[PDB]
Amino acid sequence: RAFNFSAGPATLPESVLRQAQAEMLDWHGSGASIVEMSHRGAEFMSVAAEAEADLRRLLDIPDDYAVLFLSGGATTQQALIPLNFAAPGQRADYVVSGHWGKTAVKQAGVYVDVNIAASSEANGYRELPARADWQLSRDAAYVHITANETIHGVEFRDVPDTGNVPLIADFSSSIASEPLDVRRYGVIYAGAQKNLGPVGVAVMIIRRDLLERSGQPRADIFDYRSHVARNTPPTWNWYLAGLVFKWMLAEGGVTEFAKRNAAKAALVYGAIDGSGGFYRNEVAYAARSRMNIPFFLPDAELDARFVAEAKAAGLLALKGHKVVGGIRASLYNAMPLAGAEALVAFMADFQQRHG
Amino acid sequence: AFNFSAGPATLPESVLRQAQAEMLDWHGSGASIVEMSHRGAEFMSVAAEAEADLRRLLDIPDDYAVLFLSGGATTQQALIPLNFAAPGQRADYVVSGHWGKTAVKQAGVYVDVNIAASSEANGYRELPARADWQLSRDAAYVHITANETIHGVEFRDVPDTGNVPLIADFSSSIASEPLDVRRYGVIYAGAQKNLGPVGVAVMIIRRDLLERSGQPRADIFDYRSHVARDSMLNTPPTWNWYLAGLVFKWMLAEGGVTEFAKRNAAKAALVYGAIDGSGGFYRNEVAYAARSRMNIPFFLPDAELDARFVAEAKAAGLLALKGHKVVGGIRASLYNAMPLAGAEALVAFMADFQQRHG
Ligand SMILES: *Cc1c(COP(=O)(O)O)cnc(C)c1O
Ligand SMILES: [Ca+2]
Ligand SMILES: [Cl-]
Secondary structure, eight states: EEEEEEOSOOOOOOOHHHHHHTTSSSHHHHSOGGGGTTTTTTEEEEEEEHHHHHHHHHOOOOOOOOEEESSHHHHHHHHHHHHHHOOOOOOEEEEEEEHHHHHHHHHTTTTSSEEEEEGGGGGTSSOOOOOOGGOOOOSOOOEESSSSSTTTTEESSSOOOOOSSEEEEEOOOTTSSSSGGGGOSSSSEOOOSSSOOOOEEEEEEEEEEGGGGGGOOOOOOGHHHHHHOOOOOOOHHHHHHHHHHHHHTTTTHHHHHHHHHHHHHHHHHHHHHHHTTBBBBOOGGGOOOEEEEEEOSSSHHHHHHHHHHHHTTTTTOOOOOTTTEEEEOOTTTTOOOHHHHHHHHHHHHHHHHHO | EEESSSOOOOOOOHHHHHHHHHHTSSSSSSOOOOGOOOHHHHHHHHHHHHHHHHHHHHTTTTEEEEESSHHHHHHHHHHHHHHHHHHOEEEEESSSSHHHHHHHHHHTTTTTTEEEEOGGGTTTSOOOOGGGGOTTOOOOEEEEEEETTTTTESSSSSSOHHHHEEEETTTTTSSOOOOOGOOSSSSEEEETTTTOOOOOEEEEEEEEGSSOOOOOOOGGOOOOHHHHHTTOOOOOOOOHHHHHHHHHHHHHTTTHHHHHHHHHHHHHHHHHHHHHHSSSSSBOOSSSGGSSSSEEBBBOOSSSHHHHHHHHHHHHHOOBBBOOTTTTTTEEOOOSSSHHHHHHHHHHHHHHHHHHOO
């Protein structure tokens, strides 16, 4: 098979893509395309309601959290979060463990007093900053973390304690990759084209008491309270997200993905750690991501040969991000265990031939 | 059947057929558009065609920027004052209907909105004379709604705003006829109306306006950064950009905006002809110079006959003709994808309905 290890867009389940193609002119036999459905018609309202109900069941989202499906990606929500959940220039704490947290900080500085409570940038984002050294603010509007740093392969494995300050977490690249204890969070959000919502579908899960905050002066379209009262993806995108949620449920839910993703990552790290130094991962063991695994061969020429020979072998999109170099194997929910097995077998053969 | 919906609009059948056929096999490549990286060479080539085709379709000069954006027209109605006005600066708005009211609503927190002209107090039937507009010398821009879908009111000219740039919402009429882009500071259009349900908004910006500082704002809310990153400042909606590009190609293959000017003038002339010849049986009160070519509301002698018109038309295969809830009546939307034959079928039904009920 052709395994697609792209960090973005994530590989989508074949059956989901096949279904979306097959009924694109004839949804459920109705004779009309999902693309041309009115958002307010009975047909699409059922699609949207099933998408929300299925996501709530997948992640065990309580009724006292709101669920939003949104356009504009994670970066738009990184601007809207301080505008909705902080007073103007109120302090907000950010923990920076990689590129996507830096981006979240960049959007928010205009609107809130952004405090870097901790950062691993000085060591090149090779670890999580130790919780003991975090410098949290008593009056912070929230503490923002990036659950899984997609470029740097750095992942939280424990929900940090932030006292009585709500925790806000960017789960773009790991949402629904394992059980998520929603009640521990003030806000969980995820951009599109990573682990959960496909093209054009960002997700936000919001503890409802946070909607009682004034926030900052803002247009209605930038007010989450107005979104919850009644900037949603196109219908076909929302329908595609709903198909993904149904697929995840059919596969066994987050109980199954926890086991599958742990197994995929253990195989790849095992292949790295047992390679006698030919493959090298530089992330602290306690922070090693299950979802995005960066590693390096002895030089960049071998890195390039690996990407090209892997591509020829049906293993796609393995070149690391520019700001890191090397190789990056992404192992999202729709990547089967067989794909990690195929990568590990290729890694063994490649080393036998070039090492 | 013919679908007269004001939104979402009828998509050309050929566009949906092509999109379905190559969903998993774009250009014979075996690759799906929905899984393409936006910075990969394949989708980069799609985005370049989409911009080139739109520039060709509307004759957009090089000193205007073209953006493809998520968030719809309402998002851009908040971003326009944040990008093109200083905090609290005067901004002039012309309200000829409900989409203008929505634009005012999004902007009021960021700029000192002045209603330079409005028809709200008479149910949006008629705008004041141009000489009675209260335009502000210090305004950051004048915002108009080119076509208002609920009341069927359209600018058939371009108002003179002096040296204050004109910003125009073309969601329901973009590419329905030639447009002299140079007469505008900003042209923008959300999806679902004359573009059809393509899932992306377009903006056309005179590049000197990007030299303005606007208001302190996140980078993701900064059109300057969107232009610098070619509408890929963050992850764009790729599939939707691709669908919009198919619509542009379809519009060019039909003969471009000169052909749609002819077709849309002919569809509207047929329907207004049926209204105007009816002896008052079909009522439309919009002054002729402001009559929309794209959304044509009219009223039967009473609401019971409006309901009979909707129902009997539906049974005749003429769909989605009920007027917006806030006005009642009938509304025939006649977007680019609606063929002349649809207007002919509607007018034949209008003649038979009046023969029977009148
Ligand atoms: C991919 C990714 C993003 C991307 O942000 P968008 O605005 O959706 O492009 C954000 N956060 C994380 C953790 C990511 O992995
Ligand atoms: Ca600040
Ligand atoms: Cl749409």
